[PDB]
């Protein structure tokens, strides 16, 4: 039967995204087809078990021959395209606050289950018309240039243990990008990424980050830059928002604020759930 309607939605990176509608019932699901060349299925399938309103509902993971079909709820847009559409006006700060609040909710849930995203970027965050935003694309990498701008420094320095703090770093970068309408650290290589971080937050030392000089890719020949004023880096963000961001961007992953602790930050205490200012 040709009782459904399947249509290409676009994109690249990992795969092609499709929109399927059930004509008789009206039901709609999204599909992502991604080619291969079993560790991926294990990590991708765990998201069927993680049910949270700020995590995309993964309906199934289907391994057929040399392809992988991901079936999930159909959300209308991703945060990167919404940021582009909002570039002229900016996203209203109540909406930025709500989105950040909701994303910290989803990461708190993930991190309480000792589940990490590890590859957070705006392209992985989906929004609907009712004001919700959801984490998506867990584990897809298991099946680098694009992900670089949001990578925590301990990863760039070759650390082998990824804590939950790597997701908080990435979200901090997305927070700054929503506020300023420009990526915070747009590196074109691993070393350019590190140096862009160093020039803004100061070149890290053993005082601010115990153990940093013993990481695999640390080099004493790193140039020594001084810390910059956050009021210059994310204007015109308010003092509360700046306090939160700086705790999200501590160098030492143990000092970086947790998702739970961040939810209690004074920045969030007038948070609401407004609908998107655009037709998104």
């Amino acid at each position: 039967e040709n009782f459904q309607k399947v249509e290409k939605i676009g994109e690249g990176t990992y795969g092609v995204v499709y929109k399927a509608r059930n004509k008789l019932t009206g039901e709609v699901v999204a599909l992502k087809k991604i080619r291969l060349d079993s560790t991926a299925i294990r990590e991708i399938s765990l998201l069927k078990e993680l049910n949270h309103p700020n995590i995309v509902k993964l309906l199934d993971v289907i391994h057929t021959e040399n392809k992988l079909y991901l079936v999930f709820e159909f959300l209308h847009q991703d945060l990167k395209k919404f940021m582009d559409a909002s570039a002229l006006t900016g996203i209203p700060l109540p909406l930025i606050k709500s989105y950040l609040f909701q994303l910290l909710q989803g990461l708190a849930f993930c991190h309480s289950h000792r589940v990490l995203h590890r590859d957070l970027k705006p392209q992985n965050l989906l929004i609907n018309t009712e004001g919700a935003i959801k984490l998506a694309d867990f584990g897809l990498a298991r099946a680098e240039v694009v992900t670089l701008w949001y990578r925590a420094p301990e990863i760039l320095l070759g650390c082998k243990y990824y804590s939950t703090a790597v997701d908080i770093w990435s979200l901090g970068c997305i927070f700054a990008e929503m506020v300023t309408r420009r990526a915070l650290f747009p590196g074109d290589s691993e070393i350019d990424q590190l140096f862009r971080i160093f020039r803004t937050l100061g070149t890290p030392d053993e005082v601010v980050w115990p153990g940093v000089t013993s990481m695999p890719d640390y080099k004493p020949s790193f140039p020594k830059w001084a810390r910059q004023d956050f009021s210059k880096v994310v204007p015109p963000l308010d003092e509360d928002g700046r306090s939160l961001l700086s705790q999200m961007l501590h160098y030492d992953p143990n000092k970086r604020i947790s998702a739970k602790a961040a939810l209690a930050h004074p920045f969030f205490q007038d948070v609401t759930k407004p609908v998107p200012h655009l037709r998104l």
Binding site: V6, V29, L31, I62
Partner: peptide, 17 residues
Amino acid sequence: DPAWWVCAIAAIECSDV
């Protein structure tokens, strides 16, 4: 019974040539 979208995957597989 399987979900309705089993046919949608069948259709994409068919038209991926």
